[PDB]
Design a protein around this ligand. Structure first.
Ligand SMILES: CC(C)(COP(=O)(O)OP(=O)(O)OC[C@H]1O[C@@H](n2cnc3c(N)ncnc32)[C@H](O)[C@@H]1OP(=O)(O)O)[C@@H](O)C(=O)NCCC(=O)NCCS
Lengths: 371, 366
């Protein structure tokens, strides 16, 4: 009863068209590993450097549940002479790529919510990486849509959507009418496509949500929010604007992870959060029609789902979209909600729970209202 | 009832005066021109122009600034601070500065780590994307709850104060707001138009639900953004995939156009806010304005107050720190909030890149 009338009333989804199957990608890494492992063969049999392993489509799917992923530009990523998208600098007078994707997803969420630019007071860009420091990309999006009010960029990586939803609900509580929350994840821009353990994890996407105070629109009423962060170096990327002054050389300016430590750390934390949240609301797990969990690893989600809802929880109650999208970082829970929110009936309960880098966890109990 | 109950400030040790900086750039532009005698004459490359300490101070009021590392900035063969990578086990530079300012703010507010529910890092440039350095600051301080990074450049502190106030109204007890500005990391020291503008600093503030603690109670907030390319830095994580070649990956601005747009917008927002709160300029003890250019602040204060407006009513710290982007208003509040007595009013107004403007009416309580 903290957010009476505050509802997610529309979502929108954009992905780039080109697709990389697990096989195209595992092949690409394999080529690069075969040429690196023989270019440096004199030093491989010398204890000095490195021994590179490849991978296969079946190794990816069993570690993750991922099958394919959308990407901004497929040639450069798959090319073993490059291993990164082939993009072109845009002039200042055109929409940046991040603004461009955000606008596409935003127009869809606005149409789904039945609102236009004049109805929106706040724009939040919340994702794991921003294309530039200033002017804020959220302000670029606000201006492209013709929105008046104010906008800002916000980063807490994997949990940026749930943290942003709280910030949206807070701004509405204090007087905002409606908030546009945008998540643009171009993860192919900071993915290390050379590493077998992480090159498959992420895909590209833009999501958007409309949050409004309303007693007359269909949407998900926000009932309770628990945000949590606890510093961890087990996921980290050291690229930044001070690298040039550091004359940096350490090859750690991309995604890096100790996935085993993350697995062991994150699943118990998330399950503890959700269960304490359910007890606080006096809901049982059986009262929850849908768990929209972070969309990174089906093996994590299955563990959490069993910890929270029981070994016999039906799989339809925890929709998986990472099979199609791979990990879209902050946008994951929103994709899942965008695809399956229609599966929740009026009066029924759902839980949105992000978790990942920073160690950040964000968990939101919602209830559907159909008008 | 929400009050700013404590502020904290940190600046690095080494100081650069305008003449050191002008000397340094003049040496670079002469080496550049003494080299390319041909392409200047060939109508290909333009002849770079130098700088003068006299212009800097008359145009802006800045006299000196604190820098993270001095010799690399002044070196005409380098023109950027000399820094070292730290391993993940060590506190990063941005978190380190933020921790120092935060401890001072916490001590000034009479609160400890267990008292804080949210940490916001709000500034114009984050040292990395993930893990958020606000979470690194939260952990270093032993604070529990949650933390996030937030960027709206010049107005990050005022937007962050609004986000802090909103979280408290939703049930947070107290919020720590940190602004760390290592502008020497993204300034273009080759460009005479902008090399003198920015300095380095960190600031912090404690915001609390209280009616019993000395602080500035927040009474109204107006935030505004309007996209403009007149201040822009195109550096980012997609440059690599772009195979970028254009030399626009540092601070860049058209200063005259910024003045024409932002000055009347600021005067209009502050005046509209005083009307809504049924205050007059005469009711405002102190205006803590963005600390970028003293001449502009003076002109803004004349269009808001009146011909007889004491210049002391708009404190200046940019003479000492230069432009400190998001932290500027907080240095002003920290250095001169003691000059506001019980029941008196103040205005905090940040403005600049994005275009962004944030304006806050406060009232002191003792
Ligand atoms: C950046 C700023 C200090 C420059 O001051 P200014 O009075 O506007 O200077 P101008 O851009 O008009 O140019 C002044 C002249 O001196 C020259 N000049 C510029 N920098 C110089 C320098 N460091 N040294 C010597 N001469 C310089 C210029 O070339 C120009 O001559 P030109 O146009 O024939 O080439 C000022 O414009 C500013 O603060 N802009 C930002 C405003 C803001 O942030 N908020 C607005 C508050 S309302």
């Amino acid at each position: 009863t903290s957010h009476m009338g505050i509802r997610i009333t529309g979502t929108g989804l954009f992905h780039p068209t080109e697709i990389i199957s697990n096989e195209e990608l595992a092949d690409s890494l394999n080529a690069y590993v075969e040429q690196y492992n023989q270019e440096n063969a004199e030093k491989i049999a010398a204890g000095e450097l490195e021994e590179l392993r490849g991978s296969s489509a079946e190794f990816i799917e069993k570690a993750s549940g991922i099958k394919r992923r959308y990407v901004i530009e497929k040639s450069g990523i798959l090319d073993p002479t490059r291993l990164r998208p082939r993009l072109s600098e845009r002039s200042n007078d055109e929409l940046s790529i991040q603004a461009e994707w955000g606008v596409i997803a935003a127009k869809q969420a606005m149409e789904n919510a039945g609102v236009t630019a004049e109805d929106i007071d706040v724009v939040i860009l919340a994702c794991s990486n921003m294309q530039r420091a200033y002017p804020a990309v959220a302000i670029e999006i606000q201006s492209a849509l013709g929105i008046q009010g104010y906008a800002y960029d916000m980063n807490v990586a994997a949990s940026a959507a749930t943290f942003g939803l709280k910030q949206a609900a807070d701004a509405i509580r204090s007087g905002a009418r409606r908030v546009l929350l945008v998540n643009v994840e171009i993860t192919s821009g900071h993915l290390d496509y050379r590493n077998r353990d992480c090159h498959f994890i992420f895909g590209d996407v833009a999501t958007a949500s409309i949050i409004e105070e309303t007693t007359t629109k269909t949407g998900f009423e926000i009932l309770d929010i628990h945000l949590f962060t606890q510093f961890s170096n087990n996921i980290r990327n050291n690229f930044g604007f001070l690298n040039r002054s550091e004359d940096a050389v350490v090859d750690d300016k991309l995604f890096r992870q100790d996935g085993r430590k993350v697995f062991k750390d994150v699943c118990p934390l998330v399950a503890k959060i959700i269960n304490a949240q359910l007890e606080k609301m006096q809901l049982t797990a059986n009262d929850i029609k849908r768990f929209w969990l972070h969309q990174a690893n089906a093996n994590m989600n299955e563990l959490i789902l069993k910890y929270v809802a029981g070994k016999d929880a039906d799989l339809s109650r925890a929709p998986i979209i990472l099979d199609e999208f791979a990990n879209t970082s902050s946008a994951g829970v929103i994709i899942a909600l965008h695809r399956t929110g229609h599966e929740v009936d009026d009066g029924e309960y759902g839980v949105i729970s992000s978790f990942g880098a920073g160690y950040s966890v964000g968990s939101i109990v919602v209830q559907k209202h159909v008008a």
